[PDB]
Design a protein around this ligand. Structure first.
Ligand SMILES: [Cl-]
Ligand code: NA
Lengths: 59, 59
């Protein structure tokens, strides 16, 4: 009986541990996706600001 | 005996998950911390290009 009970609880533990983990991984990928967009925007604003700095140096 | 076999497997499993889990979060936290210094810098390259622009605008 003690063994049976322990199997039950571990199985529930392993599920819970997987759920909790996949939840956090996703939300970290979230952050990562968002940062990727932001880096992408500020890299174009640099590309732009830069290009127009050049047309500016011309006249 | 089957139950013992199974409890061992489950206990070793639970440990593996937590470990794989800890490891994937670390790697993600490292990509984040990385993508915050890429954004940190591009986001300054702008505010100087923004200044260089302004002195250049009034010739
Ligand atoms: Cl398993
Ligand atoms: Na499983």
């Amino acid at each position: 009986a003690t063994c049976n009970h322990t199997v039950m609880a571990l199985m529930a533990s392993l599920d819970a541990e997987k759920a909790q983990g996949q939840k956090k991984v996703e939300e970290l990928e979230g952050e990562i996706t968002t940062l990727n967009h932001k880096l992408q925007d500020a890299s174009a604003e640099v590309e732009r600001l830069r290009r127009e700095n050049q047309v500016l140096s011309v006249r």
